[PDB]
Every structure is written in structure tokens, then in C-alpha cells.
Swiss-Prot record, chain D:
It is found in: Extracellular vesicle membrane; Synapse. It comes from Drosophila melanogaster (Fruit fly). Expressed in a specific population of brain neurons, named E347, that are necessary and sufficient for proper body fat storage. The chain holds residues 128 to 204 of 254 of the full protein. Belongs to the ARC/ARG3.1 family. This is Activity-regulated cytoskeleton associated protein 1.
Length: 79, 164, 164, 77
């Protein structure tokens, strides 16, 4: 599972929503309670495409619900 | 004999984690072995720098009142203690190529996974995270539910290496 | 143990300010640490020169009656203490190119602005004179009325560097 | 007045101050007391070019004064 997670980095066309949904779907199969919200957000953040990494930073995320919100506002603006 | 006069250990600001940690460990082991009264080591700290570091000390000398503050100033100005995600990405970057034994690879990967914040990761998840990035030649014979600590993995890898 | 017999510090007249200042500081710190009675350091000053400097000492030995006169003779013959305007022009010459962090640049610019006559320039005008020659990548985020001492500027530059 | 507003979106060259003063001077002819500051700023924030909009976001600015400050700092570069 850990090997599969870091293989295919995000492409240059998929919206952020589908990517977060698939990555969360692949991360629930590990035994429960070994990973709380913060380290999971840290592991997920290294593979985002360059369009989003150059604006939002790691200073302010405060869990997943915020990342989807900032990504949607940055996506409606036509990049 | 704690005049900090005869010591063949030096530092010149090469901007890397390993050289800085080696220098700090050698100074602190020297102070523990020969015998300093924790105040004479501040009056003779300037006998160990050379080149670019001596200008830095002559610049920032007036903000050092104790020994621990000076060692923290060195560690903070010459190592910016890298964040969490870059260590994970650098860690999964490299694979174990052939013509490289187990000892060098395990030493480097255990030296990389010590810059994380302490108390987050025990031994079992660390070995499970390490086990994926090994070559097929060892991995055909050392399958899981057989090792629990790094000593056993190193031992069985050494036997399979020197046997054939 | 002040016979000035075992010391691995040397000098050979390379005609530069930094090497001379490093040599003078190392000798004076050695005399403060090990213990010399301020007269034996003149009888054993000739155990530290080599090459071109030993001929100079065998030439001008008969004009040294104390220790401070000898250290002043070294500083005056091998450093001509450059005037005011060339330091300002050299200072505004170079800009901060990319692939160069803040610490090296701030160390060099603070090592250059110490050869002026003392008591003319305090900290605020010095930081205001330094702030113009920085690259756009830091300067887009570290705008003024936010820093007052060099420690805060180094800290915020280090955060903006290691963050992205 | 509502038709004349929302016409002529600001072009790349016009500075933020000139554009803001005209659009506020033209909004005072409506009958008095029909609008508070919040809805007025919400109406105005739909015609600025892509240049000023990518950085500031509507959740940040509150009153009708901070927008000028953030626009000036973004326009300095």
C-alpha cells in the first residue's frame, strides 16, 4: 500500500477533488488508529501539481476541509 | 588540562547537516573527557574556527552569554532543520541499486529518519516503511513474519550476501 | 606552559585583511588562555613566521621594544587601512545573485562595514543602507516597518527560504 | 443607473484609485439609505481585472478601506 501511494504523481489536468477522493480511498485500508489527521495531511501534500503549490502553503491548512475550499476558489479563477 | 589549546578538530561552514553534527559531537565529547569548568570553553572557542567562520564570530560575539546559547547559535545559523514532507519525498526517491550491500543503505536510511519530530514513529512502522525499497535479490528470500528488529534483518541479509 | 613552543598557527604575508585579522586574534586568544607574562611572547615571536615574513623580521627586529608595538607594526605594514569612499563604492557594487542564501550575504556585508571610523553609524541607518541590495524574491514579502534588528531580518528570511 | 454600472470593466492600464473613486461617485445617486457598506462592496468586487483578483480574496477584506491598501501593495510591484 505504501509503495502504491507514491508511484503516480498528480497529472496536469485532473481537478483537485477527484485526486483527494482517490487518495483518501486508498489510505483507509491501513490498520485503524495508526495515523491521525495531521500526519495524513502531511503525507498527502507532497504530490500536488505545481499549479496549486505556488499559492497555498503549509502554514495554513488546518485539516482537509480547508484544502478543498482553497483549491476550489483557486480553480474557479481560470488558473 | 582543559585550556582547549591542543585540539585537531575544526569547522569552516560547509552548509551540511552531517559535518555540523560531527563537529558538535566531537567538541562535547572532548569537554566531557578532558575536563572543563563550563566557563573556560567560552573564552577559548575562537581557537577552532577558520576562514568564513571567524568573520561570523567576530560579527556575532556580543550575543553569547553561556555555552548552550553558543551551541544553539551554531546549530540554528548553519542548519535550518528541514520540514516534514521533503524528508518523506527524498526518502522514497532513491531505490537500492545493485553493487551496494545492505549495511551502507540501512545506515543512510536510519540517518535520514532522525530529523522528524520525536515520538511519532516506533520501530515496527519504520521497518515496514523501509521494507518496500529493497532489491528483488534479497527480497526473494527474506519475506515477512520473520524479522522484528533491524539486527535480524541485517543478520539474514549478511548471511544471504556472503553465502553466494 | 607558556613557552610559545607548540602552536599550529602560522602566517606568511598574503596581503589581505581577513588573514591578518584571523592571525592576530588567534595569537591574542592563545596568550589570554594559556598564560604568558607579557615579556616571553617577544622572545618567542620568531617561531611562528615562515617564508617571506622571516626575512622581514630579521630586517626590522631592532624597532620592537614591547608587544603592542610589534602587533602594531604587523598591522601597519601588512594592511594599509583603506579610506572611506572606496568602501562605499565596493559596497554598492555587488548585487545579491540567485542561488545565494541570506546568511553568507549578511555576513560579508557586516564584515565590510567595520572598516569605517567608529561612532558614525548606528544600526538603523545601516539596515536601511543594506535593504536596497536584496533580490525581489525575498523583498516581495519582507517589507519595512516590520524589522528593527538584523536578527529579525535573518529569521524571517530563513523562514521564507526553508518554507518553499 | 444599474445598467450604466457593470458596463466598461476596468482595463489593464487604469490604476485602482482612479477606478474606485468614479465607481463610488456614481453609486450615490440611488435613493438614500437603501444599501449598507457590505452589499455595496459585494457589488463592486465583480469587475476588477484578473491581475488584482488572484491574490486578495473576498473572505479577507471587510470594510471599504482595506481593499485600497491591499491593492496598492499589490500594485507597487
Amino acid at each position: 500500500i505504501y509503495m502504491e501511494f507514491f508511484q503516480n504523481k498528480q497529472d496536469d489536468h485532473d481537478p483537485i477533488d477527484t485526486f483527494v477522493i482517490q487518495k483518501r480511498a486508498l489510505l483507509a485500508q491501513l490498520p485503524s488508529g495508526r495515523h491521525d489527521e495531521e500526519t495524513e495531511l502531511d503525507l498527502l501534500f507532497g504530490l500536488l501539481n505545481i499549479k496549486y503549490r505556488k499559492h497555498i502553503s503549509r502554514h495554513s491548512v488546518h485539516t482537509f476541509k480547508d484544502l478543498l475550499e482553497q483549491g476550489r476558489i483557486i480553480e474557479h479563477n481560470n488558473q | 588540562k582543559g585550556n582547549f589549546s591542543a585540539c585537531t578538530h575544526s569547522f569552516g561552514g560547509t552548509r551540511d547537516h552531517d559535518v555540523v553534527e560531527e563537529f558538535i559531537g566531537n567538541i562535547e565529547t572532548y569537554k566531557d573527557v578532558e575536563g572543563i569548568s563550563d566557563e573556560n570553553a567560552l573564552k577559548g572557542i575562537s581557537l577552532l574556527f577558520y576562514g568564513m567562520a571567524s568573520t561570523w564570530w567576530q560579527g556575532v560575539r556580543k550575543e553569547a552569554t553561556t555555552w548552550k546559547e553558543a551551541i544553539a547559535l551554531i546549530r540554528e545559523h548553519f542548519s535550518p532543520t528541514k520540514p516534514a514532507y521533503q524528508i518523506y519525498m527524498e526518502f522514497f526517491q532513491n531505490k537500492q541499486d545493485d553493487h551496494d550491500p545492505i549495511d551502507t543503505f540501512v545506515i543512510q536510511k536510519r540517518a535520514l529518519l532522525a530529523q522528524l519530530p520525536s515520538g511519532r514513529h516506533d520501530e515496527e512502522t519504520e521497518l515496514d516503511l523501509l521494507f518496500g525499497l529493497l532489491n528483488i535479490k534479497y527480497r526473494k528470500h527474506i519475506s515477512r513474519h520473520s524479522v522484528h528488529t533491524f539486527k535480524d534483518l541485517l543478520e539474514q541479509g549478511r548471511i544471504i550476501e556472503h553465502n553466494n
